[PDB]
């Protein structure tokens, strides 16, 4: 290209004409591909509206049984093919996928499509499209994206499955030689991801938020319907929900099942294979004629008789700060041990007592907390922020614990840690979201807690603007959104962060498989040598290393 440009257009005119466009913009005579750039992107990219076209290649995926695997489709108009509201509408159709043997993953149950919609200008909300045929408006100068997810049943036969997604520019069956065909190929392999998550990831759900936003009075018939809707939707993400009301001095009432332990709904919840752990409330959920002491005796007496009691825990206090709080936990714990001594009590903390340090510094007072509470807490759930990027001081935490007697170390994340550490704050990248669980795996805790998934600011209408709480990083405490904000459906809308939480929990399961066949040192070394995760401030920034790791697990760990 000369200094004056091609044909005298001036500076830099003509650096790639980029294939002349065809001169017709008529979708009934021009191939879609000549009207719209379409390509695929990995599930770990947050695909912004200014992402540049790449060349469409076929997509080759891997998934175990009982695994969701995902990818994305990007679309950006080259021209108007609807002169009159640009750029134009496309139709999207997906097929079933089918193996040689003639086994199927069906559109609708396995295979789903969602649009990726920005929240505060960041890609985050996954809104459903009609199946098997949908339509999407494309605007000029904007990349528009679709999240394709495939859920493989636990019973699904292994094999190479294959299919197609068809994109057709429309004028305003539409399929023709003019349509663009995306070729999908998925290998289903022999691993079954455990039906019961190997890591209990307990996730709070605020009942106040539901009461105010969906306008349902606590205790009512309609309230039970809304918590049921939530509880069932959330199980698909390999988490163990609990509802949560906060109390005087950050006591918490926490409860997985709003049903009395008597009801047949209680056992329908609590012995679900998908549910790894459940909160049992200390006080009555619904008001009663009984005293709390009276109710608790009766509830524990039932529950301990059931085959699911091993999944029970009690979460009584959110971050005791001072001595009185630590004392309260001990009193309340022993109340409970009197009705069943094998009760597991969980306590979240980031500090020792402020007014009565247990040592000459904060971190060492923090480390001594088990000694102050033993044996009146079984699950010591600690704030990750407290460690900074010192993965070496994990041992200082574990050295005060008694694994051999049923004590466990768990972690949680919240308004900290921050960039560039793994978390689920809006603006954080996809690998940084998925790395929460790479770090949980590496550091060796036996479970995980997130304080809230629906902790919006207060609203009194289902479809109200989703606004975020003052003083917190937007996204902290919010992993999913109301259906009705984005459509007329009541079904919750997942965040990208919630999908990357699931993918990260699937990753945990691959790493546990590999560890069980080649040992701890070998699995630690896979996670690092592949480039996936080195430390809290050093993890992959790209997708390939993840494929390398999952691929190495498949090659080495089949029977
Ligand atoms: C457990 C946790 N206890 C606290 C919560 O009460 C706050 O709402 C949250 C805000 O980030 O931070 C930590 S997480």
Numbering used by the authors: 11 to 182, 256 to 642
Study text:
In Group 2, NgaAt was active against GalNAc-β-pNP and GlcNAc-β-pNP but not against Galβ1-3GalNAc-β-pNP, indicating that it possessed MR-β-HEX activity. Thus, NgaAt is a different linage of β-HEX from GH20. Among the enzymes identified herein, only NgaAt (Group 2) is a β-HEX that acts on β-GalNAc and β-GlcNAc [NgaAt (locus_tag = AT1G45150) is currently annotated as an α-1,6-mannosyl-glycoprotein 2-beta-N-acetylglucosaminyltransferase (EC 2.4.1.143); this annotation needs correcting based on our findings]. The active site of NgaAt in Group 2 also possesses a cleft shape, and the second β-sheet of the (β/α)8 barrel is longer than that found in the other enzymes, followed by an additional β-sheet (orange). Thus, NgaAt demonstrates more diverse activity than expected and possesses OR/MR-β-HEX functionality. NgaAt was inhibited by 25 nM GalNAc-thiazoline and by 25 μM GlcNAc-thiazoline (a 1000-fold higher concentration) (orange and yellow). The increased number of residues could potentially reinforce substrate recognition in Group 4 and GH123 enzymes. Additional structural analyses (comparison of crystal structure with AlphaFold2 predicted structure of NgaCa, comparison of apo1-form and apo2-form of NgaCa, and comparison of GalNAc-thiazoline-bond form and GlcNAc-thiazoline-/apo-form of NgaAt, NgaDssm, and NgaP2) data are illustrated in Supplementary Fig. 13. The structure of NgaDssm (Group 3) bore a striking resemblance to that of NgaLy and NgaP2 (Group 4) (root-mean-square distance of Cα atoms [rmsd] = 1.5–2.3 Å), while the structures of NgaLy and NgaP2 are identical (rmsd = 1.0 Å). The additional N-terminal domain consisting of ~80 amino acids, found only in Group 2 enzymes, was not modeled in the crystal structure of NgaAt owing to disorder (orange circle).
